[PDB]
Design a protein around this ligand. Structure first.
Ligand SMILES: CC(=O)O[C@H]1C[C@H](n2cc(C)c(=O)[nH]c2=O)O[C@@H]1COP(=O)(O)OP(=O)(O)Oc1ccccc1
Ligand SMILES: CC(=O)O[C@H]1C[C@H](n2cc(C)c(=O)[nH]c2=O)O[C@@H]1COP(=O)(O)OP(=O)(O)O
Lengths: 183, 183
């Protein structure tokens, strides 16, 4: 079965499957279309599944895709553990600029549903972490947008102390207001 | 580039996704709706993602769902390695009773596309293996059918050199001529 926990931000949900465990090992539906739609209240189609691997402390900057290319993302961690973050970047939203952070691990099997209109990011807490997620729309380079991980206006409280290992592009990410200039 | 390898049985395809990076930091699309559809030539919708964990030698399988509940399955291995098998069980098929076996590992990132009309099974080769897959239709116990792993009519050549561990349900599977293939 799966427990659905609401977060401080309405549209952002934490999902916690409980697995059917036995001698072989375990089995669980990590996703079920019908179930998810009733749970979200709207039809939603995931067209792309991504899988990544990161070393401890690697933080994948805050990302999002603009307008029609915005991606809703249902993310989970298949190996290791990460601290996952969703930031509301809808200018007209009551929770604009607010963030939600959740520990997602292969062990706890938590998933975080991040609707279109949010920026996403995560840091690897384990030696290595393998991150999996489903997106409601296709990857579109021309639509990419980013926000610096430690932006003060959002003020995310990241679980680490050291400076994160960042990609060229995330280290050079704009601040919240700059990033959303034309949005 | 992404590779699609045809097997001895026409409709069964091996997919090897385009992978960026090495095995200490990578990223790949494990699924892409548009890409898969043009690849198969027909529209295909996956409504369920399943995730399982098995210990070495656990053989799960020779499962299928009948008629309208038949599931097309796109399978891969996110942790460890398994020997995956697809068996053609379409009575009117030229390849009826034939099987295809492929090693799927976290490392090689291969995926096997098994259309409706096939029975599926796999054995865990690593200490533990985490198997992931997408199904085109929902789980349907009343529609489910099974076939004993060592059925002689099919004659699968299993890799393990030791007796497989089977759930009680699979240990009780019938032989091909007794399997409930239709209705
Ligand atoms: C109580 C319980 O164990 O529920 C089952 C059925 C469930 N399941 C299984 C599949 C294949 C699916 O798509 N969805 C789903 O919810 O996952 C569990 C594992 O199913 P399984 O077929 O892998 O294994 P089983 O050998 O223990 O036989 C059982 C099957 C049904 C009920 C009880 C036992
Ligand atoms: C890692 C993640 O969770 O999402 C990534 C990767 C994703 N992407 C990336 C590529 C290269 C592709 O073909 N498809 C695709 O969906 O688009 C996002 C941006 O990847 P990026 O490689 O363009 O930039 P980066 O330096 O910030 O990684």
């Amino acid at each position: 079965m799966m427990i659905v926990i609401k977060t401080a931000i309405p549209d952002v949900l934490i999902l916690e499957p409980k697995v059917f465990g036995d001698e072989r090992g375990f089995f669980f539906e990590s996703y079920n279309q019908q179930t998810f739609e009733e749970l979200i209240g709207r039809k939603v189609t995931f067209v792309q599944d991504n899988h990544s691997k990161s070393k401890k402390n690697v933080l994948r900057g805050l990302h999002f895709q603009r307008g029609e290319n915005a991606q809703g993302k249902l993310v989970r961690c298949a190996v290791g553990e990460v601290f996952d973050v969703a930031v509301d970047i809808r200018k007209e939203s009551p929770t604009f600029g607010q963030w939600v952070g959740v520990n997602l691990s292969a062990e706890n099997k938590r998933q975080l549903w991040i609707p279109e209109g949010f920026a996403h990011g995560f840091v690897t807490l384990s030696e290595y972490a393998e991150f999996l997620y489903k997106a409601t729309n296709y990857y579109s380079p021309s639509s990419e947008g980013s926000i610096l991980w430690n932006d003060e206006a959002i003020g995310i409280e990241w679980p680490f102390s050291q400076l994160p290992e960042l990609s060229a592009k995330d280290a050079a990410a704009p601040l919240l207001d700059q990033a959303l200039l034309t949005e």
